[PDB]
């Protein structure tokens, strides 16, 4: 049993603002919920589909990619 709804990873969120990103995923999935901090930020590891890590630099743009996790 590992099969959430809604998409798992926006990829095309890369180099969007934090804000944006973190919206489209829960837009785009409404199963889910997106959380905004920046590169380094001590935050969770393990998986959860109603959490979807939004890592962004110091200008608040998404450097990394915000997947269920």
Same mark, same amino acid.
Not at 31 to 58: P, Q
């Given at each position: 049993?590992?099969?959430c ?16 990103? #973190?919206? +489209?995923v ?5 199963? /889910?919920?997106? *959380? $905004?901090?920046?590169? &380094?930020? #001590?935050? +969770?590891?393990?998986?959860r589909?109603?959490? /979807?890590?939004? *890592? $962004?630099?110091?200008? &608040? ?9």
């Amino acid at each position: 049993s590992r099969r959430c709804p809604g998409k798992n990873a926006w990829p095309e969120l890369v180099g969007k603002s934090g804000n944006m990103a #973190a919206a +489209t995923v829960e837009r785009e999935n409404r199963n /889910v919920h997106a *959380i $905004v901090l920046k590169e &380094g930020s #001590a935050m +969770t590891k393990d998986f959860r589909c109603d959490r /979807v890590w939004v *890592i $962004v630099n110091d200008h &608040g743009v998404v450097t990394s990619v915000p997947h269920i996790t």
